[PDB]
Design a protein around this ligand. Structure first.
Ligand SMILES: Cn1nc(-c2ccc(O)cc2O)c2cccc(C(F)(F)F)c21
Ligand SMILES: Cn1nc(-c2ccc(O)cc2O)c2cccc(C(F)(F)F)c21
Lengths: 10, 236, 234, 10
């Protein structure tokens, strides 16, 4: 959901 | 894991290799600016600095071993701290000045928030007098990342791991000071001196986060979606 | 110039121990505080009477008296809530899941969530206390950390203070070395203890925000002293 | 001015 979450998951 | 198996020199090499680049601001001396525009310069710079910080965090030994939920939490707590210590690090060789970007040098007299500037100036002045090394800097920055939000079930297993990695960086710092010919007494003192800075960096972060909140409510300074989500977690 | 530097480590320890402020009591009302008016009233009242002792304690801290009056004021304005909090988590060590504000006033987190914002401050204070208990924090270490907070928290806002801070560092290492800790265990424990101070600063700033909100809402009256401490912050 | 100014005096 979070932007930080998506970018860390990359 | 791999973070615990690293030597002190391997730890330093890893941190130096993972160092994020220095970005430029959108500052234009031929363009007029306003209190809000100069604020936009900092937030915009910080926004695309976060994308580099995220990839920097992944390459910090022990960080990727943590759950994605904990990685998110640690960055939400320390992102402004990490930005600020990065600022005062590159502002060292500029007495009475803050180097936000190579094309953006600001002194106390451009206080659009004097109090935060003076604190950053003092912190940078402290680094200059201590002759802070780049090797010490990347250790301190990684410490902030792992420590700033470690105090917020089998989850405890991760907390101890962070504590273990934190101890490794401590040995790494001592290793550097010993390599620099400092006496055992001087090593303890310098270590203490360096870590006491982090209390102030934490203080400047909390003060800055409150100003970031006001800029949101006043709704004139452009704040990116990422910065808003960062602020939202701090005001959770 | 300053006596604090000629002090030996054991003399530094003895000076800090002897200067320790008493553990004050809250009102002997057997009522469990749940209302934000009842709880925060007790916390502010307790803070009021403790601040008088803290000032007296601050004077007896080696190096503090050598500073100008304005510098002494500034340091206390910056660190007073940190000092109260580190005192809280110290005496709350032997009471896991509880905060010992006073021997007759123990607050758990279930009371904290009856006040908006406090339950996170409580949880942060509880975590710090448990962290101290797990590090087996000694009283001699505690009095060093508290003096560090007093001297460090306002330093920027001058070589003398840095020299005293170094003395306390030597004193901390001295204590750990007396406890039989190896050199590695000495600089690791020192690092661990000093990293707690960043979180203590965090809780103080958060606590100062809540204190300011109480002044605005105006329901819990604040003493003139607490108001001047709060104004100094903002 | 400040109460702290006075209490620190003795
Ligand atoms: C005080 N301050 N400083 C920065 C900042 C931006 C980039 C950087 O590399 C370092 C920084 O401290 C920054 C970014 C966003 C918001 C703020 C402020 F709100 F003022 F606290 C900021
Ligand atoms: C959060 N908190 N905690 C205390 C406090 C009072 C006495 C003491 O010995 C230790 C404390 O942390 C305290 C005193 C006054 C106001 C606050 C609050 F506003 F909540 F932050 C306080």
């Amino acid at each position: 959901h979070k932007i930080l979450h998506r970018l860390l998951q990359d | 894991s791999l973070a615990l198996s690293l030597t002190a020199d391997q730890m330093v090499s890893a941190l130096l290799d993972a160092e994020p680049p220095i970005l430029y601001s959108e500052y234009d001396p031929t363009r007029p600016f306003s209190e809000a525009s100069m604020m936009g310069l900092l937030t915009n710079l910080a926004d695309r600095e976060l994308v580099h910080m995220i990839n920097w965090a992944k390459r910090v030994p022990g960080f990727v071993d943590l759950t994605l939920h904990d990685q998110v939490h640690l960055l939400e707590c320390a992102w402004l701290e990490i930005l600020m210590i990065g600022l005062v690090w590159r502002s060292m060789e500029h007495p009475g000045k803050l180097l936000f970007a190579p094309n953006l040098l600001l002194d106390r007299n451009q206080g659009k928030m004097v109090e935060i500037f003076d604190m950053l100036l003092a912190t940078s002045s402290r680094f200059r007098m201590m002759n802070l090394q780049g090797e010490e800097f990347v250790c301190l920055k990684s410490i902030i990342l792992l420590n700033s939000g470690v105090y917020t079930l089998k989850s405890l297993e991760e907390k101890d791991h962070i504590h273990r990695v934190l101890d490794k960086i401590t040995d790494t710092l001592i290793h550097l000071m010993a390599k620099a010919g400092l006496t055992l007494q001087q090593q303890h003192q310098r270590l203490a001196q360096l870590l006491l800075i982090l209390s102030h960096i934490r203080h400047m972060s909390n003060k800055g986060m409150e100003h970031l909140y006001s800029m949101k409510c006043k709704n004139v300074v452009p704040l990116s979606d990422l910065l808003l989500e960062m602020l939202d977690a701090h005001r959770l």
